[PDB]
Amino acid sequence: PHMGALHVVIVGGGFGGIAAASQLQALNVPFMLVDMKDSFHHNVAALRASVETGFAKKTFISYSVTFKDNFRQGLVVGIDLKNQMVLLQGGEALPFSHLILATGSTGPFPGKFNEVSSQQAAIQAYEDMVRQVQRSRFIVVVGGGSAGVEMAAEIKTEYPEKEVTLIHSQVALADKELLPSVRQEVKEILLRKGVQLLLSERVSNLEELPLNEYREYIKVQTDKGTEVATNLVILCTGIKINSSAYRKAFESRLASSGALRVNEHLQVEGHSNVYAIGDCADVRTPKMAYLAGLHANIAVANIVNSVKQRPLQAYKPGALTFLLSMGRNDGVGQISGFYVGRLMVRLTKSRDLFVSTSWKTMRQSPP
């Protein structure tokens, strides 16, 4: 029983969650941010952190330094809707008047890092990854979605002398939703960088492969009988909505995606005090970090606007913005539905990978 008082709980400390937490902190609204890690992960830069020595420490930002007693590390195992509690592993419970679900996506390392561990262990996992890439003359990237084409491009840009093969199950690279001109340019850039492309092939012995580790010899097989000898296998095979925290409680209002259905105010269907932001919300746009932060502004604003009996802010998508960095010197993509070239993408994304915007949000300075 909050007896009218606000206490917001944010489940997930990603791009959406740290934006929500930062705004709630500036409004002096009581809240608790929950994340399984001890630091925010700027995962847009996770592939650069897999190939550049010393870079990983720029991609993890301590929660407690920024949020102090408004942060609690923990693993959310469920949501008790009748008694308005967030259920943590270990048995602890967090009461809320409003709930913001910002649980993001899960997938293979290095592109995603969803482990309970300390900031130094997380940084070391990416430094270890860099050392496996450095030891490995021959490298296979599996999956030619937008992550795989970035992974392969990063390796060949930092290490032109390595042999890199990208194996992709479709005939075209990167998102089906992209302008065809963008998808063709991605292909032409990988080929000009010397990446060997095996298109329309599915790697078929994934269970038998050592992953993210150098070996003197690894044989990759595909369903068409192609065999590739390599020293290192990196998986960029896709991601899944991380419905872990809320799956049982909200099974009624889940999309196929695993996301939560929401109106244009980002309240979860059937609720007025539960919001979903970022990857876990069921919007028609693609899963983007910058959209996560914009949903965060909308959700917090609507919590306040609901208390002030004011009209709620509305989320209105426009045409697709999607930028692919192709190593630090190259890239291609589209901004609001039209093509942008390699100089533009290099300057906007490939050089810094938006890293400074997260340190600014967290009001910390990178080491």
Ligand X SMILES: Cc1cc2c(nc3c(=O)[nH]c(=O)nc-3n2C[C@H](O)[C@H](O)[C@H](O)COP(=O)(O)OP(=O)(O)OC[C@H]2O[C@@H](n3cnc4c(N)ncnc43)[C@H](O)[C@@H]2O)c(O)c1C
In 3D, which of 272, 253, 281 has the Cα closest to residue 15? 281
Rounded to the nearest 10°, the torsion over CA 151, 136, 209, 205 is 70
Calpha distance 165→167 (Å, rounded): 6
> What are the binding residues for 6-hydroxy-FAD?
12-16, 48, 76, 279
Binding status of residue 147 toward ligand NAD by CB under 6 A: yes
Neighbouring residues of 123: CB distance < 8 A, sequence distance ≥ 6: 56, 57, 60
Applying CB under 6 A, which part among 7-15, 48-56, 139-147, 260-268 lies near ligand NAD?
Answer: 139-147
> What are the binding residues?
12-16, 48, 76, 279
The entry of ligand X, ligand NAD, none that residue 170 binds, CB within 5 to 8 Å by partner kind = ligand NAD
Site for ligand X in 137-196 (CB under 6 A): 147, 150
Calpha distance 141→167 (Å, rounded): 6
Site for ligand X in 218-247 (CB under 6 A): 242, 244-245
> Closer CB to ligand X, residue 307 or residue 338?
338
Report phi then psi at 67, rounded to 5: -110, -15
Site for ligand X in 22-81 (CB under 6 A): 34-37, 43-44, 47, 75-76
Binding status of residue 151 toward ligand NAD by CB under 6 A: no
- Binding string, residues 95-124; x marks residues near ligand X by CB under 6 A: -------xxxx-----x--x----------
In 3D, which of 18, 72, 66, 26 has the Cα closest to residue 42? 18
Calpha distance 273→295 (Å, rounded): 15
The entry of ligand X, ligand NAD, none that residue 175 binds, CB within 5 to 8 Å by partner kind = ligand NAD
Rounded to a whole number of angstroms, the CA Rg of the chain reads 21
Binding status of residue 287 toward ligand NAD by CB under 6 A: yes
Applying CB under 6 A, which part among 158-166, 170-178, 289-297, 334-342 lies near ligand X?
Answer: 289-297
Site for ligand NAD in 220-239 (CB under 6 A): 236-239
Calpha distance 293→298 (Å, rounded): 9
Q: Look up residue 235 and give its amino acid.
A: L
Q: How many residues does the chain have?
A: 367
Binding status of residue 258 toward ligand X by CB under 6 A: no
> Closer CB to ligand NAD, residue 146 or residue 157?
146
